[PDB]
Amino acid sequence: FLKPRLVDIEQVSSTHAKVTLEPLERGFGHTLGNALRRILLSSMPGCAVTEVEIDGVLHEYSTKEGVQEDILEILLNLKGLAVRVQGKDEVILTLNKSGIGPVTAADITHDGDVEIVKPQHVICHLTDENASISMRIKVQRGRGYVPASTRIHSEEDERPIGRLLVDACYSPVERIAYNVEAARVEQRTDLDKLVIEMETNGTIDPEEAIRRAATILAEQLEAFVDL
Amino acid sequence: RRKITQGDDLAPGVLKIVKVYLAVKRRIQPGDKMAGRHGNKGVISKINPIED
C-alpha cells in the first residue's frame, strides 16, 4: 500500500478550515473519513467555564439588582463563549464592570493564556450605573462532554453558597463532513483526495488536531499489532 | 412591611410553617417520551452521539 501524505491544508478562516490528503487509496477516503470524524467528535481538547463564583449572587436562580438578564441565562451565554488557552489547564478570569452597557468578551480581565476567538460576544447587559459586579470565572481544559451531574459524587464539597457550577462542554468542533473525489494523479489506476471540512467554534487548529488524532489512533494501533 | 410582618399566620395551632424550595433540573435521556403536535408519539431508545 502506497502511503498517504498531506497536500496543502486549506486554511481559510479561524471558524472553518479544510485539511487535505492526496495519496489516499481505493476506498480509504471513506475508510478514514468516518473513522476520524468519531475522533474529532469525542477526544477533543476543549475549554469550558466550569465554576462561576459570584460577588452577591448565591444561587443561579436570583437576579442581581443591577444586571439585566437572569443569572442562569448569563451563565448559558458563558457556555456560549468560545475561548482557547495555551498552558494553564485551570485558570480564573475576573469580570469587573459597573455602568449601563452590553458587556462583551473584552471587558473581562483577559489573561495571557486566555484568548477569546470573538471578543464581540456580548454575555450580559447592565441597566444600572452604580451596579458593581465582580465575578471569578474558573475555566479549565479537558475533553468531551462532562456534566457537573456526573461530577457530583465527589462534589469537592461545595458548602460555600456562592459556588455556581455550569456544564463543562469541551467541544471545539461543530459540523464535520469530508469531501471525497477522484485524485488527479497522472500515473496510477486510482487514488482518492480527501478535503475534510471541519467547522469549529474557533479554538483548536486543524493540523494540530489531526496529529493529535494520529496520536490517539497511535495508541489504538498498539494492541492490534500485538495480539 | 405590615403584610411582611403579620401576614405569616397560616393554620390554627401550627402558626409557624417553614416551606423550602428544591430546584432539580431534569434532562433528556434514554427513556423519555417525545412527540409532535401532529399526533406522532415516541420514546427515545438510545440517544447516540452526533457522530452517527
Describe this structure in words.
This is part of a larger assembly, with chains A (227 residues) and B (52 residues). Chain A contains 3 helices and 13 strands, in the order ββαβαββββββββββα. Chain A has helices at 28-42, 71-79, 206-225; strands at residues 10-11, 16-24, 45-54, 83-84, 90-97, 101-103, 115-116, 124-126, 133-146, 163-165, 168-170, 173-182, 192-200. In chain A, strands 3, 5, 9, 10 and 11 form a 5-stranded antiparallel sheet that branches. Chain A is elongated. By secondary structure, chain B is low in regular secondary structure. Chain B has one helix at 2-6. Chain B is built from 1 helix and no strands. The chains are: A alpha+beta (227), B little secondary structure (52). The interface between A and B is small, with 5 and 4 residues. Chain B: DNA-dependent RNA polymerase catalyzes the transcription of DNA into RNA using the four ribonucleoside triphosphates as substrates. Chain B: The RNAP catalytic core consists of 2 alpha, 1 beta, 1 beta' and 1 omega subunit. When a sigma factor is associated with the core the holoenzyme is formed, which can initiate transcription. Chain B: Belongs to the RNA polymerase beta chain family. Chain B: This is DNA-directed RNA polymerase subunit beta. Chain A: It is an enzyme of class 2 (transferase).
